[PDB]
Ligand binder design. Structure first.
Ligand SMILES: OC[C@H]1O[C@H](O)[C@@H](O)[C@@H](O)[C@@H]1O
Ligand SMILES: [K+]
Ligand SMILES: [K+]
Lengths: 161, 298, 159, 296
């Protein structure tokens, strides 16, 4: 296909909306500490994905499209039993506002993928909170970096478009 | 046994002083087929003849520079270093465990930006018989090019007791993407050669995690009139990734009680004697805060 | 042998440090912890019954009590060292934990300024968190008594 | 099969409800041995003769109250109760899930101090034909003693609509210790019996985790001249543990909330709201005391 095009978003809305994301995603747990790192199922803003300022000017729909993908995926994860299992954490918690804001910005990009595909519904499990806890933070980890680029994408579009 | 560099070889003693160690065979590299002899380091002692000497290796007395001779001529060498497994874990005797940032560091790298160029600094007490080869790539399962610029000794300072030697290399990821969200870490492998002893030190990290910006550029004060209160302003450091519209930074203006502003300016109260210092961080990711940019109160 | 005895200590920097200590314990592992629920345990020291840390048992003897207290700190303080917190996902020194590690070693230093003194394992970061928590909840318990103990002494034994 | 009370027995159906269930042997208590007959509960139909009766319990129909008989007489009984295990979980019908913190929490317990005196409630939607018998203890290996004063019914609110019944119980550890780092938990075991069913509800807790000090007493303020300000004061409550010299509390101060360890304070008060204050144990973050105001 040809690289998609179209709907230029609410850069400002997005900029601020993303910005908040980078805050919420650096929560961290005293006992878990900061998750590293060893690779290696999660989406990524890659090189050829056009979110780099230069590509962003040429186009950015593909990039923005990936960001929606990312949000959608993290969004799913955050909803899963991963963050809902115990060490049971509250819907008012930093993580609550997280899933909350994720989705929100997902919506702000693709006000529902009209619902054709948009799946990639998460791996699964793990049962027993330790693996769980770790997983929670590994995802939060990946997220910090994800959301970080997005914020740059928007904050940039926001200023230059 | 493997070749760390021409005529120089590392012998992996897992189990260090234990077992039979390892059975090395050395080779005189020369046309010469007759009257070859082997000597180790100095010692006039012939250890064997033939174009190949076969030895056993357990401790350091087992390694050193092997030399072959014919008719009093040196024909070729073969320096053997040891890589030693101390109590089930390789050795680190070389680099200083850099104030644990955090714990067992040796290689502390950082980048002034997402350009893909970072520097790693390591610490050693050792002043001499030090060789340092730096290899960097991004990802193991399918390496990815990182050009490393050779370990200089960036500076040397005093730690009170004895001198601390600070090395460093620059590395450029050959084909880098500053905008991208890395999924694969860089590894920097450092071949630490001190005399006969061989050690490797490693670092794996994402550039996003080693970004530390230069301190704010052009920090300025501007008093308000008959006011002990000032218009602070600064600029993005020259080195920050461009554009700043994308690669944004956030600031901390501390007088001395700090204040935070994603602006390149703030208005403070000079308590005339103190001064304003400002520092930046990635606006969107908790990288490292730069050093302070400071300007004396008016 | 007879109940040891003698040495003060600075009831206040003690009752001070000790209570800053408790807030620490919590910060480094909030009520937003793990409602278990789970054993003979490879137990830690406990400011137990007749260790003389009651408001009464202190009027007279406080030495055994303090020795206990200090012993715990030594235990826990050591624990924060262990790869348990060092292992994956490694806890950073300045992190709320490594500051407990401070307070403890701090507080410990204020009872015995030299004094005189773990299971190790496992691996699987999976299991470190679990211990990290067991230990923490356990600790917050120790330091609590520890606090009141020093609180009282501050209030009643000195000046 | 074991005894709950006297003449009242439980029957463990660990495999409910696969066959054969359990094969109960009923024994009539009397020194006699001839002319004995048996009935189930309150129905006639002589189930059998002899000093013993061999039954097969699988379901409530098999359970109930068996009665011995010798010539127009009722020598003794035996109440057979069922304890059923479905899907690998003993039933938790009787009590209300009270899904609070966290889920499957059927027992609430609090202590207003460190005496070893605690109280525990449970929420049943049931209205009658119950029997709660509580037992407690510290530890399981060599269990310390805890004495529980009968399941009394107290609060009787009204849930979404249907009534909600609450029982609670006094419990003093036979030999408490307050000031000590409790290292072994307290054990509550509620033998709940709803007619023919029987369940057990357990809870494990260290007092410290369940501490819920009382509300501070005598909130007494003293404002200043020409000010919407007041310096206020409270006092630990008497339920609290003595001496506060050791058993230190710390307080809060509503109207943003302010926090002190001082029985006093000074805050800008407007006729709007009022001043409430509570106490939490200063050393262990446990339950915050209820509030206590003295409206501006
Ligand atoms: O200060 C705000 C607060 O004051 C008190 C009450 O009268 C409330 O209704 C209100 O939310
Ligand atoms: K070293
Ligand atoms: K129920």
């Amino acid at each position: 296909r040809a690289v998609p095009g179209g709907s230029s978003p609410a850069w400002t809305q997005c900029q601020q909306l993303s910005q908040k994301l980078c805050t919420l995603a650096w929560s961290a747990h005293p006992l878990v500490g900061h998750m590293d790192l060893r690779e290696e199922d999660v989406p990524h803003i890659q090189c050829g994905d056009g979110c780099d300022p230069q590509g962003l000017r040429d186009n950015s729909q593909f990039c923005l499209q990936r960001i929606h993908q990312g949000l959608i995926f993290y969004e799913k994860l955050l909803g899963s039993d991963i963050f809902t299992g115990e060490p049971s954490l509250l819907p008012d918690s930093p993580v609550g506002q997280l899933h909350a804001s994720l989705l929100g910005l997902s919506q702000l990009l693709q006000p529902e993928g009209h619902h054709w595909e948009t799946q990639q519904i998460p791996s699964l499990s793990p049962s027993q909170p330790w693996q769980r806890l770790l997983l929670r933070f590994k995802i939060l980890r990946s997220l910090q970096a994800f959301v970080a680029v997005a914020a740059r994408v928007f904050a940039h579009g926001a200023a230059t478009l | 046994i493997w070749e760390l560099k021409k005529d120089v070889y590392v012998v992996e003693l897992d189990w260090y002083p234990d077992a039979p160690g390892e059975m090395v065979v050395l080779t005189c590299d020369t046309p010469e087929e007759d009257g070859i002899t082997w000597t180790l380091d100095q010692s006039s002692e012939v250890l064997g003849s033939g174009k190949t000497l076969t030895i056993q290796v357990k401790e350091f007395g087992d390694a050193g520079q092997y030399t072959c001779h014919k008719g009093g001529e040196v024909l070729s060498h073969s320096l053997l270093l040891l890589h030693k497994k101390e109590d089930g874990i390789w050795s680190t005797d070389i680099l200083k465990d850099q104030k644990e940032p955090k714990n067992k560091t040796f290689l502390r790298c950082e980048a002034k930006n997402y350009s893909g160029r970072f520097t790693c600094w390591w610490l050693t007490t050792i002043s001499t018989d030090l060789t340092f080869s730096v290899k960097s790539s991004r990802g193991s399962s399918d390496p990815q090019g990182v050009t490393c610029g050779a370990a200089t000794l960036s500076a040397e300072r005093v730690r009170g007791d004895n001198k601390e030697y600070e090395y460093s290399v620059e590395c450029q990821e050959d084909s880098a993407c500053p905008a991208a969200e890395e999924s694969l870490p860089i590894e920097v492998m450092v071949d630490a050669v001190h005399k006969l002893k061989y050690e490797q030190y490693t670092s794996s990290f994402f550039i996003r995690d080693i970004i530390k910006p230069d301190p704010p550029k052009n920090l300025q004060l501007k008093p308000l009139k008959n006011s002990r209160q000032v218009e602070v302003s600064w600029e993005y450091p020259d080195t920050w990734s461009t554009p700043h519209s994308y690669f944004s930074l956030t600031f901390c203006v501390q007088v001395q009680d700090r204040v935070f502003t994603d602006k390149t300016s703030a208005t403070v109260i000079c308590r005339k004697n103190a001064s304003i210092s400002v520092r930046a961080q990635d606006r969107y990711y908790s990288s490292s805060w730069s050093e302070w940019a400071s300007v004396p109160c008016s």
